[PDB]
């Protein structure tokens, strides 16, 4: 509480850092103050992570294969490089889909060129070509391929672009060369931008000359929703219920077809700003398709969005929007009625990717909880501006928080619940603080929309008020 007590905290933690690291870190720790809209408020983001401080960031590969490209169902994604990236990444993210894995959908699988020494020394550009053929032979039903560059590929300079263009022309298949080399950039963030550009150049344009698709005045597209645990579906159902037609979901239960169809949508609904804003802007300046951001975390936020979205259309839509809000009202109402009392006033600290850290705040407040602190791994100042109007005055803010930092911060803050990633979970459970994975929903159902809200609510209560927590200290000790 109080920015003074907080600033002292920040300054205390910084003490262990050797002058160089201390100087840098201070710029990424800040006390929130609404109204402030910039970096002015001691907050700089999207910069090189300090070596040795054990950050929680990832690589460009994770940005492309991991979050953007991997999710596409009817498409084979090749982890081009040594085994590892693909393996560690195999079925890690819960980007749910509907398909016969192995025949038409391939998400679960880990296709890799399993680079071996001779492939580096001589460049596996030929290996890739041969690989592709093997793919077409063994997976006839794929509607496209994508090579995800791992560090090696970027260094040795393999002309993957050419291999893709030549094989693509020959086989008449869309083969997308992505330069998401882990070292390129500073986190998964650039990976997003790269993946987006790849889509723009190799996939989107495919249907520009085609006009066969029957469009409607209510054709919308959900972009930036990876259907984690079903998130996209739970969001889609609402939109369509209010008369809209979701032509495509970007990296949810996504197929290459619907991605190519996207340029025909009347409006683009951006959920995850940080990852899709790039392509969203491109679609606008080119196809003249307007885009707006929205939030489905919690009823207040969901309803807010539903209305704002319907407002972009005519009355039939707006009228329906209200019917939808009306329909789900007793439900989410019953949800808060049951859970809020159990979570009322309980303080929460967060740290996630580049959206959720601010987006889920609404949902928390809907259950009467207070987010005393939050931060991102790869968010740019774009996000931080938006973050400040969400965080209550004097709440702690952090960018690319070091492991040590999060620990010390948590020590004084003493939140009732913490929400972060897998690399964090057990650390805080050890400390006796109820933890909940905000990346993978801790293997739980969707959180998006009303249906997801009920689940989110149950989960928070389930953990936060679990009897296991009282039993941390053995009776024979005090």
């Amino acid at each position: 509480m109080s920015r003074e007590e907080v600033e002292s905290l920040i300054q205390e933690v910084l003490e262990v850092y050797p002058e160089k690291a201390r100087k840098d870190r201070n710029k990424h720790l800040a006390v929130n103050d609404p109204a402030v809209t910039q970096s002015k408020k001691c907050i700089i983001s999207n910069k090189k992570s300090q070596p040795g401080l054990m950050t929680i960031r990832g690589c460009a590969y994770a940005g492309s294969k991991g979050v953007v490209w991997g999710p596409i169902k009817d498409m084979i994604h090749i982890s081009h490089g040594p085994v590892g990236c693909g393996q560690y990444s195999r079925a890690g993210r819960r980007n749910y889909y509907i398909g016969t894995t192995g025949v038409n959908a391939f998400v679960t699988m880990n296709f890799t060129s399993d680079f071996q020494e001779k492939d580096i020394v001589f460049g596996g550009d030929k290996k890739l070509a041969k690989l592709i053929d093997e793919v077409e032979t063994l997976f006839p039903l794929n509607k496209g391929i994508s090579v995800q560059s791992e560090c090696p590929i970027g260094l040795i300079g393999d002309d993957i672009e050419s291999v893709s263009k030549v094989k693509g022309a020959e086989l008449s298949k869309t083969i997308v060369p992505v330069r998401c080399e882990g070292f390129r950039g500073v986190s998964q963030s650039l990976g997003h931008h790269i993946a987006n550009d790849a889509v723009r150049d190799w996939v989107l344009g495919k249907r520009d000359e085609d006009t066969t698709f029957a469009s409607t005045p209510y054709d919308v597209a959900i972009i930036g929703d990876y259907n984690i645990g079903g998130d996209a579906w739970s969001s889609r159902i609402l939109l369509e219920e209010m008369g809209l037609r979701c032509v495509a979901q970007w990296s949810g239960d996504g197929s290459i077809s619907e991605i190519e169809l996207t340029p025909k949508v009347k409006l683009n609904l951006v959920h995850c700003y940080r990852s899709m804003n790039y392509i969203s802007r491109h679609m606008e300046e080119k196809y003249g398709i307007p885009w707006m951001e929205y939030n489905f975390f919690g009823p207040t936020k969901t309803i807010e969005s539903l209305r704002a979205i319907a407002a972009k259309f005519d009355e039939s839509i707006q009228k329906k929007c209200e019917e939808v809000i009306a329909k789900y009202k007793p439900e989410w109402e019953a949800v808060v009625a049951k859970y809020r009392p159990r979570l009322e006033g309980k303080r929460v600290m967060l740290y996630i990717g580049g959206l959720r850290p601010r987006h889920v705040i609404g949902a928390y407040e809907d259950l009467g909880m207070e987010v005393v602190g939050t931060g991102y791994e790869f968010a740019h100042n774009d996000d931080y501006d938006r973050t400040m109007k969400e965080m209550g005055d004097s709440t702690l803010l952090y960018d690319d928080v070091t492991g040590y930092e999060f620990e010390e911060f948590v020590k004084r803050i003493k939140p009732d619940l913490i929400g972060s990633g897998i690399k964090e979970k057990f650390i805080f459970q050890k400390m006796g603080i109820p933890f909940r994975e905000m990346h993978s929903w801790d293997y739980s159902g969707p959180y998006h929309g009303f249906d997801g809200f009920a689940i989110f609510a149950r989960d928070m209560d389930m953990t936060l008020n679990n009897p296991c927590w009282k039993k941390l200290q053995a009776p024979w000790e005090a």
Binding site: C59, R90, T100, T137, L138, E407
Partner: protein
């Protein structure tokens, strides 16, 4: 919708009619997916010998590998030493992956750092990353030792770890005497186990090479033990149990059992007990060194025999009856400690369990995969039980290892219809369980998809997976289990027999139809 009183998560939820209908429309409307017929067709195709053949003709594409890159092993190896902090010189992305990969298997925290090399660090060669990274690491997490590993990036650009570290010390970034062992672990060579090997050998060199003068074999009256890449807490513990049970002076080099099982008591212990640096420095003074998993400790073997002058026994991984006997007897010989009646009885009990269950076991055909040693051993035990390891797959296996297993198979009638497969991924195995269908398959969590595939063909085609190995992500706490020694043997035996009985009960659960064989006693 949702019924507050009985909330439905993703699973029962998306089965609701309004949801189903939505997906149907989505599919038919913008997915353009192949007709259900084509899908069904291509699927049935992927199960034929014709497909399998083309599948095995693969020379580039690797699908669903059964391995991981070197650095992962280096890290695990690093975690086995007291207050040591794994440091992977290279891209930060890897470290995040390593941590999580282990996080999920152990359901414990996994401390590891990267010096976060980026674009210009790769072009200009990240020597600064090493300097700052080391300084920052020590200052922040206060480790007593830092074990440096690498990423393909750092391996391609030839970053001289040694030069960097040396300069890091000379330029005052860290105390000159601070233990900073390193190891080159190219992702694109060998596999995770090789990483473990390299990392260990490097550490062994660090605390030994120079100080070899005052060392004398046997002087410490201990027997060095190298576990190698081990992901079962029980496997470390059983070895230490038996050794202590015999009263054998030993020294387990790289013991992360503590780090991987910190008690949850409101306190977070980043580091935990492990192999003390002194144990490593004193290691050459040991009577000898036993490598629990020889097949991936090759480099270490050469260093131990060459520099430490230890006559490392040609022992197989202590798995199953025979091999455990050999292990104990060898240890007994080296330490002069007679096998206690304690262990003798334990051996007898396992035999008893074997005799009690031989009926159901005898004849059961299995498909399996995992690291070389693990597999090799699993095979031997399977043979001892009277089972048939028809499909033995070890992606990270080599020519010599294949021969070894083949010889083992040729030593028993039960190995008659077995076939060892090296450099083969799980997609290859998928075909094997379709064409030459076994009863069950023993492996890591990745096999659950093979079982999914098999069942999709038909119930009688479903080949149940028995989770033994690494990694196991879809089952809580199996990492506590044991596979080594009679204890591990007993567990495996029990697990197998019960797995068989389970499937039988299911198959015979059909009332009126198949429940006639649903026996109360088995």
């Amino acid at each position: 919708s949702q019924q507050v009183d009985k909330i439905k998560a993703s699973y029962p939820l998306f089965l609701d009619q309004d949801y189903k209908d939505m997906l149907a429309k989505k599919r038919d409307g913008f997915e353009e997916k192949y007709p259900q017929d084509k899908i069904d067709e291509v699927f049935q195709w992927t199960t034929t010998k014709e497909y399998q053949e083309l599948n095995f003709q693969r020379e580039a594409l690797t699908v669903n590998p059964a391995k991981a890159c070197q650095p992962l092993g280096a890290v695990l190896c690093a975690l086995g030493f007291e207050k040591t902090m794994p440091y992977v010189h290279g891209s930060q992305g890897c470290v995040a992956y390593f941590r999580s990969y282990f996080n999920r298997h152990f359901r414990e925290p996994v401390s590891c750092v990267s010096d976060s090399m980026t674009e210009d660090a790769a072009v200009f060669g990240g020597q600064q990353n090493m300097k700052d990274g080391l300084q920052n690491c020590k200052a922040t997490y206060k480790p007593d030792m830092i074990a440096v590993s690498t990423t393909c990036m750092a391996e391609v650009i030839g970053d001289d770890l040694n030069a960097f570290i040396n300069n890091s010390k000379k330029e005052g970034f860290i105390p000159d005497e601070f233990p900073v062992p390193f190891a080159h672990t190219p992702s694109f060579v060998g596999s995770h186990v090789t990483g473990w090997d390299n990392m260990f050998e490097g550490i062994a060199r660090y605390f030994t090479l120079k100080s070899m003068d005052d060392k004398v074999v046997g002087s410490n009256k201990k027997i060095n033990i190298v576990p190698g890449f081990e992901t079962y807490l029980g496997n470390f513990r059983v070895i230490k149990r038996m050794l202590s049970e015999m009263g054998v002076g030993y020294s387990l080099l790289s013991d992360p059992e503590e780090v991987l099982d910190t008690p949850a008591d409101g306190q977070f212990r980043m580091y935990a007990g492990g192999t003390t640096q002194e144990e490593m420095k004193d290691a050459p003074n040991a009577l000898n060194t036993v490598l629990l998993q020889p097949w991936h400790l090759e480099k270490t073997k050469k260093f131990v025999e060459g520099t430490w002058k230890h006559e490392v026994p040609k022992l197989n991984i202590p798995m199953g009856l025979d091999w455990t006997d050999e292990f104990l007897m060898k240890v007994s010989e080296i330490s002069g400690q007679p096998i206690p009646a304690s262990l003798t009885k334990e051996r007898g009990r396992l035999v008893d369990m074997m005799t009690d269950s031989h009926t159901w076991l005898h004849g059961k055909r299995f498909a399996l995969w995992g690291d070389p040693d693990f597999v090799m051993g699993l095979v031997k035990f399977l043979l001892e039980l009277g089972c048939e390891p028809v499909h033995i797959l070890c992606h990270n296996g080599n020519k010599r290892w294949k021969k070894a297993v083949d010889a083992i198979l040729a030593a028993s009638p039960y190995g008659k219809n077995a076939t060892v497969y090296i450099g083969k991924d799980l997609w290859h195995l998928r075909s094997l369980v379709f064409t030459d269908k076994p009863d069950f398959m023993i492996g890591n969590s990745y096999g659950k998809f093979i079982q999914r595939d098999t069942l999709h063909k038909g119930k009688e085609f479903e080949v149940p997976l028995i989770r033994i190995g690494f990694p196991i992500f879809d089952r809580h706490h199996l990492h506590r289990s044991t596979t080594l020694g009679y204890e591990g043997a007993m567990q495996i035996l029990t697990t197998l027999v019960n797995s068989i009985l389970e499937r039988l009960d299911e198959e015979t659960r059909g009332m009126q139809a198949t429940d006639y064989n649903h026996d109360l006693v088995r």
